[model samples]
Target: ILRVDANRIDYLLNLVSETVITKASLNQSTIEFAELYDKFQNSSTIYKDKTRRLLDKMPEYLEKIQQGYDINSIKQDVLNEYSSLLEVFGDFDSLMKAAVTKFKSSSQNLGRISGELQEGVMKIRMVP
Candidate 1:
């Protein structure tokens, strides 16, 4: 004879149902990637604009040469002397950091949750 448990059947169904939900847990990863991907693109866009703007300034130095000035005098014009901006540091650095950090965290949480979830269902075979 075997143990009779109405509750065990209920648990089996609940556990099975949760398994379906967990397949969708990884679904959250897709969402997370898109959001961070957009942020990454924005950072890239800003960086492109950032580097290009600074690089484009090279012509101004060249333009001074067009006027027959020496390189020292051109640099002394102060465009090259001052910081691009006092408050800024690296372009796209923060953005690149943010996305990968999120990818690590969100993937670990969601995948581990599902990992345990998939494993848990197998142990339930003993209920038979």
Candidate 2:
């Protein structure tokens, strides 16, 4: 059996014909946060620090919007979400975890290569 769930963001993009992204106009805090997020994406260290920096900038964006600014200052949020997606795309960790579970179920005598090959085929069945 096959299940389907569309990515909701694509629908949101279609609903909003055009988004006026004003990343250039962000205040200093948002700039710092974006930079740190990029660094985290590359370095993979201090993930908590990267996440904290991202959280710190939300209030600033909210205040800017609240004050009637004509631009959206949510660069940090976009970058953070993208970074998180890059880290988890294809469910890399879960794929490996499933292999481990399958191997254990076979009493650890299963061929690792065969398990990986079967997992690859199983994953293909899930893709639309």
Candidate 3:
């Protein structure tokens, strides 16, 4: 007889699938952002061209963060490490939770910066 906790297995399977799909989309998002930049780069209005360049940089920063953590890898590592420590350790879930909390906060900060940068560029573009 095989021993397995079906619920745990299902949970992790979902996590793995979601993270992998999410990773794939991140690259797609970068390409789309880059394409927008290319489309506007030659605008006769200099400010629009400059704004597009700044908008383009948003995807680059996000891509760098994606590469830095490689979210799927991080999820796998967290699962493996948490599983290894589950038997002997107390507060193991909290440890993993803390890691995720920090990761989420960092991601939010990056998004905020990207939005602010975009807004600043848009403001500049609005000038005559």
Candidate 4:
């Protein structure tokens, strides 16, 4: 005759319960990445607007800087607007990249670990 391990069930119940928080938080990092990615695009759009606005003002900016033999630092006072060109144009932020990379790596490990947990719990189902 076949029998169920009713006596072994309580320990398994607690083992399965251990995953509740970890499972929910697995995607917690994912949502933060989504939010930051949206902001990244938002910053790029603002930078674009500044560069386009400069197309007309650049000539005026140059004209005002016509003081002869001006020291490099002095000319920088006029050209400071161009510094925004570099601010959001390249590299952006390695911080965001780290978040993205961490999310991806975490997702991979989460899926693999949860899959293994599923297999372990699924064995309990088989035992019944």
Candidate 5:
């Protein structure tokens, strides 16, 4: 099920983070080479994918709040960030959906592939 509360969010994020970290750390050398094509090489694909999924979900949450759902007085900075993130949902969802369909139509595999590519890119950009 889609995450609608912190309980689900925290659980999902932790699961994604652990897997991505492990994948990103494995075979650091090939990942460095893979960085030439992708930018998030060293980082976990989990994080990048999280951003994308959040981009999709944020708007739904904001719409509820905007319609007078009485949110728990979230901080201004976080609200602003949520607004910004929500703003892109339409386009992000469209593009991601099209890409997902064009690829294999399995968001799970798409996320994995994107995460791997992203991890490769992040590693190359690591500055010392």
Candidate 6:
């Protein structure tokens, strides 16, 4: 038994996805700022060295989740597979269809909630 409903789970996934995006953006900004700082500290290689080291792994980190997971595709595949199992149980198709519809609507609501949560989290991070 999972704690919270599907919406909460979907909302959590949304938060995780936003965090991933924010981390990438933050990494880029950090590198940019480090480079700018290095330029002004004549002959100092500390910032430059640090920035270069981070930049070296930037490609690797980004490559892992570049396209990310295709949630829609996964959802479609689940429904398709479930549909194939309908013959095993009478009226199961109608029951499943309704279930899927409810789940989809909850997911959409979770998406909206996640977006709002992301903005709230981002705002907090922005404040000095």
Number of the top-ranking candidate, with lDDT as the measure:
4
lDDT of 4 by residue, 1-128 (tens): 44445644665565456556445665677777787778788888988887886676666656656745455654574467678766764554776777777767757766766776675555555322
* RMSD vs true structure, all candidates: 5.8, 24.0, 31.0, 4.3, 24.9, 27.5
User: What value of lDDT does candidate 4 attain over all alpha carbons?
Assistant: 0.65
Regions more than 4 Å wrong, model 3:
1-6, 44-128
In candidate 2, which residue ranges exceed 4 Å CA deviation?
1-47, 73-90, 105-128
Q: Tens-digit lDDT track for model 6 on 1-128?
A: 32345555566676777656655655655565465445446324444554554555446445544657565654565455444433324443465565456556555655776778766544443212
Model 5: per-residue lDDT, tens digit, 1-128? Answer: 32244554555565566556645544343443354225333233544555676676567768878888657643453566656545533344454444444334333554675676565444434333
User: Per-residue alpha-carbon lDDT of model 3 for 1-128, expressed as tens digits?
Assistant: 44455555665565555555555555555565465455445333554444555566556656766778576655564455444434333443465465456556545655665565554434433222
TM-score of each: 0.44, 0.33, 0.30, 0.61, 0.24, 0.31
Index of the highest-TM-score prediction = 4
Per-residue lDDT tens digits for candidate 2, residues 4-106, read 3354434444333222122222233355456555654655555455566667766777787778865544655657655874563334346445545543544
Flag the better candidate by lDDT, 3 or 5.
3
Candidate 1 stretches with Cα past 4 Å from truth are 1-6, 59-128
Q: How much lDDT does each candidate structure score?
A: 0.61, 0.49, 0.52, 0.65, 0.52, 0.54
3 versus 5: better TM-score goes to: 3
Error of 6 at 31 (Å): 0.8
For model 1, state the Cα shift of residue 80 in Å.
12
Give me candidate 1's TM-score against the actual structure: 0.44
lDDT of 3: 0.52
Ranking by lDDT: 4, 1, 6, 3, 5, 2
